[PDB]
Amino acid sequence: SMEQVAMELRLTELTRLLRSVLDQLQDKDPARIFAQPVSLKEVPDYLDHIKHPMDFATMRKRLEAQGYKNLHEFEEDFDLIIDNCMKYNARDTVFYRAAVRLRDQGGVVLRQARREVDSIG
């Protein structure tokens, strides 16, 4: 139908905007701490601690399959990256501290993303 096509164009445009959001958030991680999944070879107990691992490469896979229906779903995944790290790692670690900085800097980007998503529909 024409409606299904219009819906699909909306999703494609959301995907375009979320790709730009993702790039901007990932720039706030210049150390690449959150770039890839925590390695289960190197941290073999990880899944005993963290039930829903997340990272930027995994988000990018989902994004490119158009697997984010709305900004809330995308934000959920970003918050998993941060919250997983702040639980597994102690406060006095470079990992924890990187997550705090990513959360703080990402907030700005996500605030305007939400306005754009609402504004453009």
Swiss-Prot record:
Subunit structure: Component of some HBO1 complex composed of KAT7/HBO1, MEAF6, ING4 and BRD1/BRPF2. Component of the MOZ/MORF complex composed at least of ING5, KAT6A, KAT6B, MEAF6 and one of BRPF1, BRD1/BRPF2 and BRPF3. Interacts (via PHD-type zinc finger domain) with unmodified histone H3. Interacts (via PWWP domain) with dimethylated and trimethylated 'Lys-79' on histone H3.
Subcellular location field: Nucleus; Chromosome
Cysteines paired by S-S bonds: none
Domain named Bromo: residues: 9-113
Function of the protein: Scaffold subunit of various histone acetyltransferase (HAT) complexes, such as the MOZ/MORF and HBO1 complexes, that acts as a regulator of hematopoiesis. Plays a key role in HBO1 complex by directing KAT7/HBO1 specificity towards histone H3 'Lys-14' acetylation (H3K14ac), thereby promoting erythroid differentiation.
Annotated protein name in UniProt: Bromodomain-containing protein 1
Tissues of expression: Highly expressed in testis.
Superkingdom, taxonomy of origin: Eukaryota
Cross-link Glycyl lysine isopeptide (Lys-Gly) (interchain with G-Cter in SUMO2), where in sequence: K41
